[PDB]
Amino acid sequence: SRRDEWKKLQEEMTRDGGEIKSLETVPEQACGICLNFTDNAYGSDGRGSCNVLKAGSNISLPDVIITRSGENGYITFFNSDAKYCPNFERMKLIDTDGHECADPISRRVQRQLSSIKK
Amino acid sequence: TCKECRNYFPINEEASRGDCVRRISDERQSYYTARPTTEAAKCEGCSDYLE
Amino acid sequence: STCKECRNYFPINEEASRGDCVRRISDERQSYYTARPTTEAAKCEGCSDYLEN
Amino acid sequence: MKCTECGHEAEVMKFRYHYNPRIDASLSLRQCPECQAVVTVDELKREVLGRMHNGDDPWGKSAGIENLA
Amino acid sequence: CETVEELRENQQWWWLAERERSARLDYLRKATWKKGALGGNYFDGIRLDLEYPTLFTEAWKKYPNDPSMLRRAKATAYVLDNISIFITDSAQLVGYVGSAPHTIAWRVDGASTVNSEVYNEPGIHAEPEAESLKKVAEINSYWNGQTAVDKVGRLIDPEDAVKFFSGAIGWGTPSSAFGYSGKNFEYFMKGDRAFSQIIAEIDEKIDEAEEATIGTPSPHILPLYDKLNNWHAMKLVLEAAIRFAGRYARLARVMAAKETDEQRKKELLRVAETCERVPANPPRNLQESLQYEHFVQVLARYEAHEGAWPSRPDYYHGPLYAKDVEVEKNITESEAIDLVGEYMIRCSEYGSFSPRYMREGLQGVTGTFVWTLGGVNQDGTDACNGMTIALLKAARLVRVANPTFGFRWHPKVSNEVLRECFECIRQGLGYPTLRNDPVLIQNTMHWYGHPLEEARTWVHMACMSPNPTTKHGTSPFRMASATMNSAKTIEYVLHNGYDRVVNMQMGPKTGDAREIKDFEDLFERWTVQLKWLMNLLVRTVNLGRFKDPEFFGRPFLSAITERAVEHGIDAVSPEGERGNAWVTAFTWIENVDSMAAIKKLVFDDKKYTMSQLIDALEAEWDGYEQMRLDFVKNGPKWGNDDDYVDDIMLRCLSVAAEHSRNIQCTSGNCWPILPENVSGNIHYANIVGALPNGRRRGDALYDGGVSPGPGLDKAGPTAVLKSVGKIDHVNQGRSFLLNQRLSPTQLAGDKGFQLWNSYVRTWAELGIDHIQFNVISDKVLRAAQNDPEGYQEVIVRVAGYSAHFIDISRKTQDNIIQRTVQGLG
Amino acid sequence: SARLDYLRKATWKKGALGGNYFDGIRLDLEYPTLFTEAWKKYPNDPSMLRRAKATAYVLDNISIFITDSAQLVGYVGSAPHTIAWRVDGASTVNSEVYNEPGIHAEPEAESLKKVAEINSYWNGQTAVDKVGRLIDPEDAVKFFSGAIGWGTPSSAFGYSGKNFEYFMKGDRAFSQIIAEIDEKIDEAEEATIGTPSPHILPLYDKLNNWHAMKLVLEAAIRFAGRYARLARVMAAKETDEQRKKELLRVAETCERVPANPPRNLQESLQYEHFVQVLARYEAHEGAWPSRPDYYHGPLYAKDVEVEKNITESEAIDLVGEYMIRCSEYGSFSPRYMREGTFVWTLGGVNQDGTDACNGMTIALLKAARLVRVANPTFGFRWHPKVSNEVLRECFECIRQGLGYPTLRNDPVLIQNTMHWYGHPLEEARTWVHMACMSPNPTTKHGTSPFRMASATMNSAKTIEYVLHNGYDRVVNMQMGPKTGDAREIKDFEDLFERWTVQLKWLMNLLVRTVNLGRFKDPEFFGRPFLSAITERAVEHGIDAVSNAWVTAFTWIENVDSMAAIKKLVFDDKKYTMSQLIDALEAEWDGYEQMRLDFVKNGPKWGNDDDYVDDIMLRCLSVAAEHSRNI
Ligand SMILES: O=C(O)/C=C/C(=O)O
Ligand code: SF4
Ligand code: SF4
Ligand code: SF4
Ligand SMILES: [Fe+3]
């Protein structure tokens, strides 16, 4: 059933509600500053994908579920907390400049990340 | 909680989830009733709990 | 006091209570006039543009 | 390669690739991972030559009648 | 210093135009806050409007039970009643979408992602940043979830929703919230119908409907109730519009009281009388007509985003301009030029918050605003008049980048009009963009089966696509939101339908690459990928258009269209409308150029195996720079009059056109493809990886829809014309953007017009529908790059629209500078 | 039998005596609470999908019970003594639930607090509220004022027809319907990922409808599984061997049906009772269309007479307990509507049309005789060649005074259905009693999915409006059209014209309201389960409910007044035209002699007087043509 898989992916994309309330600050270790984070290009809402983690991973809970074998990447947002992710790595080059067109790999244009010096 | 109660019953050996069974005798008829219960739920204000 | 005594208030009619608060704003690029509905009975309260008479 | 501003001595992949206006030529814009300075690179022989300022035009044009390389 | 004579001799046009224009025009031109996006960020002084979202949310909460369109009508009526309205110091035309000149409007229920981007956007919030962000978050919390785009995403197949909004293959939003719409100018802009007349018609329809619904019960009256609500909504919003105009009039009179200058007092009184006349009653002079049209557009932009400006100013303001300036000389020619230039300035001032793909895809402009000039009447005679000359002169004087001109060229165009259009081009405005009118008429007739008379009235919808303004011809929805990244097809053929950008398997598994036996297999794979992409985008946009009346609702647009007023339907409903739907194809050339490179170096040369090519593409030409140069130079390129690539281009267009005829829109019409890029060649510059045509990820894609790549063409402009002429514009596609650049030195002096006219005759004889020109020196653009201190009026034509140079992103600037400087002769 | 006696004695009657419930009956609060929570959970779902999810949540979390000697299970409510409440039926119904005395639990303060909170949530979001808002505001205020009449224009109340041929032949059960729905869903998914076209655009919301249709059946199967688990638990507790066997058989029955087609008579009866119960968890369903002797026919004949699987007396025992389970159902109804009756059809003819009567007709008659329930009254369909023994049993049953069977002349009813419906002849044979005077076939296309509640018309306020120029003293409002002052008239024919122009408006008001409700109810009030069990809805993926006739109340007193006015005032001239108006404005106060005269010589209906019958025939004939026009 591909329908269930794509429904799960869509529900993970629509991470709205309390999480929208959470946008005030970014944690010390965030997905948005991880090297393995690829920012979304459709909008600057902070959604993205993970190059390493796959499919139904989960890093929010202390007992993280890590599934590195799969077809589709893991949907993470720029403010998700990375203190429980085994594969987190602070990216060495953070281009906070928002006056240039989107670079999903290495550009972070969110307001909260504007003050995150390397 | 529920686990120690007389009327709580697990759906399957491996299922934490049970169905609560209450034996009730009304003016005209006595009958059984069931309602789901999670078995981890606090008895709290439960008047029908039995040892 | 209220919007009645403010110099920036202009009633739409000589009898009507409702009016327009009209203010002159100056920007670094341009100066203009802005109009905004007001009931003329609302207190000034925290109004930084209020100017009596 | 050897960054001009700082002797970082990284690999060609490590420098961040910006863009190349002249698709037929071999010269583009890359950013040093250490000093973050934008410099001009020669992809053909893989070394950095000079930093890139706003007014400079290193590429030129391979066609047209006005500003050829 | 910088004397007019010196400026003409040294070829400066921005400072010359600054010197030439009058004091009022100069003040109104320097009083505009630029609403374009530098990359993804707005101008520093720009602020987000909180008045409109707060008022709209407050009014929207008051009627939970009302239908979508009636509820939106009530909400926008409340906003128009309570929004701040302003008049600039020296303005004769009033109207604005927002609460202050330095402020952009926010589409609250456009999308939840857009609201999140609003919260995340830096520098657009007021001085109490904590308080402003708190208010924005309070708005978002209510408006998160019940948004129309969210409903569309929850309705379509989940795979389509995930892939479409992934930002890799689509450049559109399937709702009326963002996009544009067609205006039925034949209904409300013919001198006999204004808002009061439309209200009278709506009242008659409401009366007959209520009489039907109060008497004998029969099933025919069953669908009437919804119609009644629709009619009420339309009437309500129309009334609000009149009240809105009344507000301005009152303010004008108040200003007239304060002013101690007799001339300014007289002008303010004239503005008050104008706002009292329009939009309630049909215009009687030029100023009233301009105010009527501007009011209609401003109300439409209060209704929704409206990222395009469809209008034909010389055809509908032409009669009143002729009556005023020429027939009876009410106003001098100078005052007419002043009015037209300030009307264009008022057009430019519009600004609204748009998604990141729109913001980056439209560098320096809120949207693409194209005004149609010239053309023919419904009878077929020349429709050009003195209003066209006035518009061209005003555009030259003001030097406003965003409102561009599309001139419908036909063989009997008077020579003076051609000379004025060439003068506008030579100044560096980038417009008017000449369009071959007869072939475009034939294209509309062939694709959508429009009658000839209806087809003759077409105006540009956003950038290139013709669209008639008649009762049935006009289209009320941006069906072109099924934009496609064409390079994705060939990139998915070479990566087995896997996209690294979104870390997701996007395309169908057409088969493993690295083992393509012959060119036929590769072309079949590409055909499969192209059909998949077209089907996905068209299905998504079709469902968006189908469900828009329920999800979004449009009271004003339905109020100003004959179809909706007559039948009581929503405007975007396909009940009585011809489809007029097309697909835009970004970066189309990349596919055929990669085809040519592969077909030459792999199969017909055996210079490289497919394995080496795929490995180099995976490594992104790292360590294969010599291989990349071989693929660039040896591989034949489009635009050199070489049959090797041109036949591949024709085959690709043929299969695309066949698929377009196969698929159908909501109205059952076709879906022709339109190659064009705008600034999407820069938005997607990091979304498309390396390709066999020699591109590397992060490089800019090709400038235009069917124009040669940067420096790839070598034979000259004539070869480009011949290559583009092989395309059957009537049959192969909807339209083809042909960007070009001309040397300012050649076009200077007496003989520049003769060379341009010879090129135009060559372009017209080959049947090429569209041509664009860019006339600006490289030295000026380099100086503007070094310091933007003085070059605030330097304009460059990007793709289908013009923008100020110091406003677009640095990558776009460097790419536009790189374009070939063709030499006429 | 002893079990039948115990089950009959153990029922809490849901009928209303004198227009009120019995003391023991209570309002169920668990069902509205669970439904409201589930409704709150999903705001974005369409109406039918949201209702399906809410009903699934309720069925998962509702309290279920098995009586001490019960052989069949399934109840609409959390306890045998409680009553069902249609929480989102009508705001008037909710307010009347709040007002109604005697059906609230011992913590009356807390119970009324919960009821008030529920009403507060559902106030302004009800289907009838949506119908009233869509109609013109003046019409809404007139209709819901209560002066003209009382009506509920929505699918939450009304009569539902069941596609028995679809799911009760024995070929199909809920699993087979789920399989067919899965086939339709897979085909639609294949279409929606194919070639773009306007044809596939309707299929999306159709997919949602199919999803709701599947969800409700899955929920129903889980519900039966819950009952089976309870049966197994009770078997574990109990010691008596016979009750052990009965409980194990109940568990097996709940496991077999409604998931799979029944194999024996008990499974058939339980499957049908489950279908009915799940139907009544969806809306009010004021009728019981089912016929037992036909669709259970083959299974009972196989079990009892073909192979002697079960003893003969056990068949009558099971049928009696089935009718007992039928009687236990009840839902709250508005006081005006509470003043219907579950009617079955027996005998009849087959699809071909030859002697559908079988041994289970005799079984049903005997079970009704010994059980003596009042509400499940079944009329018999008499063909010219009914067996003599069946009629002997029917006459013996009518002798006991049960009030049934009410023999129906089958051929003339068949011809009536043939004439005004135009159904195929074979389809017309297989019809059941849907409404008090309406038959409806049970085939695929023949079956009517849903009929409206038949709103009530006050046939007396129109005369008062005529003589008061459209103004009622009861409510200070102008409702009827102002035709003219009653003081100036010419003849009783002119008075008839004024009365007719009043009555046409009065009737058109109700007809328009009910028609708009019927048109809009797919969006206002979805019906997932009803759509699930109808072949048309499953095949086309549409809501099942996609003519309206209104009952007349107090029409006889008005014709009495008309006869008195036509004869006394004009024909006999005893009183002038103004005096009656002056007496009516004072409500006959101080005019006792004139009131007594006006009622005395003013002939009452039933005198067998041609002059009175004249006005009766005129008043009914004029309305009959208007009803025909509508
Ligand atoms: O909506 C678009 O992308 C294009 C429109 C046009 O070319 O008119
Ligand atoms: S922190 Fe973990 S989940 Fe997040 S982007 Fe980095 S590797 Fe992926
Ligand atoms: S009686 Fe109370 S404690 Fe015992 S099983 Fe039931 S709910 Fe749990
Ligand atoms: S400035 Fe303030 S007090 Fe004065 S009129 Fe305006 S709102 Fe009222
Ligand atoms: Fe460096």
Numbering used by the authors:
A (entry chain B): 2 to 119
B (entry chain F): 3 to 53
C (entry chain C): 2 to 54
D (entry chain D): 1 to 69
E (entry chain A): 15 to 839
F (entry chain E): 36 to 374, 381 to 587, 594 to 677
From the paper:
A homolog of the catalytic BSS subunit has previously been identified in strain HxN1 and is thought to catalyze the addition of fumarate to these alkanes at the C2 position, thus producing (1-methylalkyl)succinates. As such, this homolog is referred to as (1-methylalkyl)succinate synthase (MASS).
Here, we present a structure of the MASS complex solved by single particle cryogenic electron microscopy (cryo-EM). We were able to build a molecular model for a MASSα2βγ2δ complex using the high-resolution EM map. One MASSα protomer is more complete than the other (MASSα: residues 15 to 839, MASSα′: residues 36 to 677, missing density for loops 375 to 380 and 588 to 593). One protomer of MASSβ and one of MASSδ are also bound to MASSα; however, there is no density for either of these subunits on MASSα′. However, instead of finding density for the predicted [4Fe–4S] cluster, the density was consistent with the presence of a single Fe ion. Furthermore, when we compare the overall fold of MASSδ to that of other known proteins, we observe that MASSδ has a rubredoxin-like fold, a fold associated with the binding of a single Fe ion [Fig. 4B (33)]. In BSS, BSSβ is the only barrier to toluene entering the active site; however, in MASS, Trp185 blocks the substrate channel as well. Specifically, we propose that MASSβ gates substrate entry, whereas MASSδ regulates GRD conformational changes.
